[PDB]
Amino acid sequence: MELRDRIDFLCKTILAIKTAGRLVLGIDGLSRSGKTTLANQLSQTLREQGISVCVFHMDDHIVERAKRYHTGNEEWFEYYYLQWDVEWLTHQLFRQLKASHQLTLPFYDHETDTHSKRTVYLSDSDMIMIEGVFLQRKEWRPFFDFVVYLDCPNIQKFINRYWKAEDYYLETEEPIKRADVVFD
Ligand SMILES: [Ca+2]
16 A cells, blocks of 8 residues: 555665674554554564564563552653663663573563563574664663654543653653654
């Protein structure tokens, strides 16, 4: 259609990047921007081009409700700073992307609000693709070779948690300016 052509163009762009070992790609975008769908379709297209791709979804690696809700802090702060154990992920995931053979991480089950340890093999992957919100925070940035920012255009609660956190991210980290490519 049209989105199909854009995804193909992104794939072409990615296949043109100079590689030196595993290529770490990031798909950064706000909540409900289609990042997850883009990541899956893109990885699929790459595999058909002969590229072995390992995919990570950051929403799988958040903390339990008790640690990101009713903490007493404003919701934007809970969402941006507490929802992810940034330091643990830096140590156990991001720093390991380039050379680790495999990773065993706690995967969050949103329905049961529990975690289970599952293993992901990196082994001979040609590329590692990570999609999620706030991917370009200072702690994780150094570990991405290429980042695409997906730019997309009760209410009070949504504003409190999502809108304010997003505004904080945009103003403090300038993800749109930092991105290697902006998928509009
Ligand atoms: Ca393999």
